[PDB]
């Protein structure tokens, strides 16, 4: 109901129709799957060390080249 915080640890690359989306690797900080590393798609400027609030932690973005 409040989401789970995750920390960005690596930047993969830009994607999307107009280069508006970045793909990152994050580590869950809290919850059932705390500690796991998964990849996600982010909209907006982002750098290593930022914290995202994921509403659920079972969807993983498809890998890009």
């Amino acid at each position: 109901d409040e989401g789970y915080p995750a920390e960005v640890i690596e930047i993969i690359g830009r994607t999307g129709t107009t280069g508006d989306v970045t793909q990152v690797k994050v580590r869950i900080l809290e919850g059932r799957d705390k500690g796991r590393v998964i990849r996600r798609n982010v909209r907006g400027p982002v750098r290593v060390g930022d914290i995202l609030i994921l509403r659920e932690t079972e969807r993983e973005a498809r890998e890009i080249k």
């Binding site: 798609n41 909209r43 907006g44 400027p45 914290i51 995202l52 994921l54 509403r55 969807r59």
Partner: protein
């Protein structure tokens, strides 16, 4: 009207506008914590030296961010609450003094009505108005579809501030309410998760649309 003790006000400590201290204001959200600047500072006017460098806006006091946000016309090329609002030659563009006065009076009203520190109320409002998930558009067969993605913290802060400013601007357009009163009302409503707040309703709609298209 205004007392002479207020027209000629002399501060003696480093605090926001010489009237409010940000020593006890706390940010609950861990994602927005490093992006809401609360360092001690008297005058919130940095003369726009931050826009040059990437991520430079991180170290700009939040009150100056709000002042810059409301220093606008409001409805130039998209409709807010069903109307264009083109202020044109009677807008607040480049008039940073008037925006300063508007924000100061709004803070006074907020403190009078709720009895709390205005900066804390502003922090609560922006925490409640910041979305957590958004969507991007794809085109297939001549039809436009949505795909859900996540939002970085700085964009969350920017969207929250812009929506607060837009709601305040809409509340005082061709009505009897003044700009300062509308801003105070919008902040108070957003702080209490009241659906009548423009920013809170916009956040709810954004999150619902993003959820329904995962």
């Amino acid at each position: 009207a205004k007392p002479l003790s207020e027209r000629f006000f002399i501060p003696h400590e480093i605090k926001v506008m010489g009237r409010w201290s940000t020593e006890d204001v706390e940010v609950r959200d861990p994602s927005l914590k490093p992006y809401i600047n609360l360092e001690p500072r008297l005058l919130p006017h940095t003369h726009g030296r931050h826009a040059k460098k990437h991520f430079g806006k991180a170290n700009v006091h939040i009150v100056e961010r709000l002042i810059n946000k409301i220093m606008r016309s409001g409805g130039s090329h998209y409709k807010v609450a069903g109307h264009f609002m083109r202020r044109e030659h009677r807008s607040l563009n480049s008039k940073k003094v008037k925006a300063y006065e508007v924000v100061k009076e709004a803070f006074k009203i907020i403190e009078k009505r709720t009895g709390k520190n205005p900066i804390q109320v502003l922090v609560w409002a922006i925490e409640n108005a910041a979305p957590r998930e958004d969507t991007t558009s794809v085109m297939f067969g001549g039809i436009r579809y949505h795909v859900a993605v996540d939002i970085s913290p700085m964009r969350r802060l920017d969207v929250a501030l812009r929506n607060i400013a837009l709601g305040a601007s809409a509340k005082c357009y061709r009505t009897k309410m003044s700009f300062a009163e509308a801003l105070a009302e919008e902040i108070i409503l957003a702080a209490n998760k009241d659906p009548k707040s423009y920013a809170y309703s916009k956040k709810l709609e954004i999150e619902r649309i993003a959820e329904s298209s995962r």
